[PDB]
C-alpha cells in the first residue's frame, strides 16, 4: 500500500546526496549523472547511512566506453548501471570540490537561464579515462571502487516504479525533451508545444499530486538556478514523454 506522495529526501533524511543537485557542464552526460546520483543515494540507503559517498560522474563518463554510448555526446543508462556492477565506480564530487577520488573536471555553466556563470556551449570533448585519484586523496583508485550487486530495468508501470523507489531508493529514467520543458520553473510539467530536442536521462526520487495533477519528483543535472532549485515535476501515470519507459536501477554490494 503506497502513500499518495513520497519524497526520498524526507524518507532518508540522513542521506545527504538525495538532496543535492549536480551540474553536467557543457557536456551531454545526463546518462552518467542520473546513474551516479541514484547510485550515491542507494549506497547510503542500503548501508543505513554507514557509507555516504558522492559517486564519480567523471569515472563513469570517461571509463565506460562505447558500451555506454558516446561520452559527452549521449549515453546509455542500462550499461552505466551494468558498468557499476562490473568495474565499479570511485568517489568524486562537484567540479574543484576536491571531494573524493575523481571529482568532475568539466566546469559548471548556465543551462537555459541567465546567471553569473558562463553560458553552456556545444557538447565538449569527452575527458580521458585516467585511473588515478587526485594527488591529495587516499585510498588508491582500485581501493576506492564501489560495486553494484546487480542492475535491472523496471517495467513500464507507474505502480512498479513507485514500489521500487519506495523500497530501494531513487532510480534513473529518461524522457523526450521538447523545447517548452527547457523553460520550466515550477508546477507540474506537461508538454504543450515546442520542437523535440532529444531523449535526456534524469533521477526520479518521489511522486505527489499538485494542482490536481499526479507527478514524478525529478532531479535534473543543470545546477540549482535552472527549474525549481534544480528539480522539476512531470505528469505521472501516462508514460508522458516516455518518463516511465526506460527506468533502470540496481542494488549496491553491501561489502
Amino acid at each position: 500500500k503506497l502513500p499518495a506522495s513520497f519524497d526520498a529526501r524526507e524518507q532518508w533524511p540522513q542521506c545527504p546526496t538525495i538532496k543535492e543537485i549536480r551540474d553536467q557542464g557543457s557536456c551531454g552526460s545526463c546518462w552518467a549523472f542520473g546513474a551516479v546520483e541514484a547510485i550515491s543515494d542507494r549506497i547510503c540507503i542500503h548501508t543505513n547511512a554507514h557509507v555516504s559517498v558522492e559517486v564519480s560522474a567523471e569515472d563513469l563518463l570517461t571509463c565506460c566506453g562505447s558500451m555506454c554510448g558516446d561520452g559527452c555526446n549521449g549515453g546509455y543508462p542500462a550499461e552505466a548501471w551494468n558498468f557499476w556492477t562490473r568495474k565499479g565506480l570511485v568517489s568524486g564530487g562537484l567540479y574543484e570540490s576536491h571531494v573524493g577520488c575523481r571529482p568532475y573536471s568539466i566546469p559548471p555553466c548556465e543551462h537555459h537561464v541567465n546567471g553569473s556563470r558562463p553560458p553552456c556551449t556545444g557538447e565538449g570533448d569527452t575527458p580521458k579515462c585516467s585511473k588515478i585519484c587526485e594527488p591529495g586523496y587516499s585510498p588508491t583508485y582500485k581501493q576506492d571502487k564501489h560495486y553494484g550487486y546487480n542492475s535491472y530495468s523496471v517495467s513500464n508501470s507507474e505502480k512498479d516504479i513507485m514500489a521500487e523507489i519506495y523500497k530501494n531508493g531513487p532510480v534513473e529514467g529518461a524522457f523526450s525533451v521538447y523545447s517548452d520543458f527547457l523553460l520550466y520553473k515550477s508546477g507540474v510539467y506537461q508538454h504543450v508545444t515546442g520542437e523535440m530536442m532529444g531523449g535526456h536521462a534524469i533521477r526520479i526520487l518521489g511522486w505527489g499530486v499538485e494542482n490536481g495533477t499526479p507527478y514524478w519528483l525529478v532531479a535534473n543535472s543543470w545546477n540549482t538556478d535552472w527549474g525549481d532549485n534544480g528539480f522539476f515535476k512531470i505528469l505521472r501515470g501516462q508514460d508522458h514523454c516516455g518518463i516511465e519507459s526506460e527506468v533502470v536501477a540496481g542494488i549496491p554490494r553491501t561489502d
Binding site: 562505447s66 558500451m67 554510448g69 558516446d70 555526446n73 546509455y76 542492475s151 530495468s153 529518461a174
Partner: protein
Amino acid sequence: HHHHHGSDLGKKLLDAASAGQDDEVRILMANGADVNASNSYGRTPLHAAANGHLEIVDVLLAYGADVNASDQWGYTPLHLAAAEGHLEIVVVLLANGADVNASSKRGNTPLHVAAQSGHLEIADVLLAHGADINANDYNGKTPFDLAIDNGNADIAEVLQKAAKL
C-alpha cells in the same frame, strides 16, 4: 537495422543478456521472446551480449539476431566487441555477416575502436577481413592516427605497414 522493438518481455531478455545469464536467455528465446527486442536507444540483446558473453552471442545468432543492428550512436555489436577486446566474439560476428566497415554516427569504424583501445589481434583480424585503413572519424582521424594518439605502437606499425602496400 535500427530496432526499437520494445516490451516487458524485451526488457527481461535485454537484462538477462547484459547480466550474462545464459540459461535465462535460452529460456526466454525458447518461449518466443523477440531476438531483436529493443528500446528507445536502439540497443538489442546482441549488443549487450557483445560485452564478453560468447555463449549468449551464439544463442542469439541461432535465433536469428540481427548481426548489424545499429543503436542510436550508430554502433553495431561488432563495434562493442572490438572496443571491449573480445576476440572470439569478433570472430563469430564476422563469420555471421557482421559489417567490418560499419561507421557510427561520429564516423567510428570497428578498426578505429580497436586501434584506440589497444586490441592488436582484433585490429589484425578486422584488417584481414577488409577494414578500411583510410576511414576518417568525426575529427578527421584514421585508425593509424588513433593508435598513434593512444600510444599503441604495435597497432600503429601494422597500420603503417598496410598503407605501405
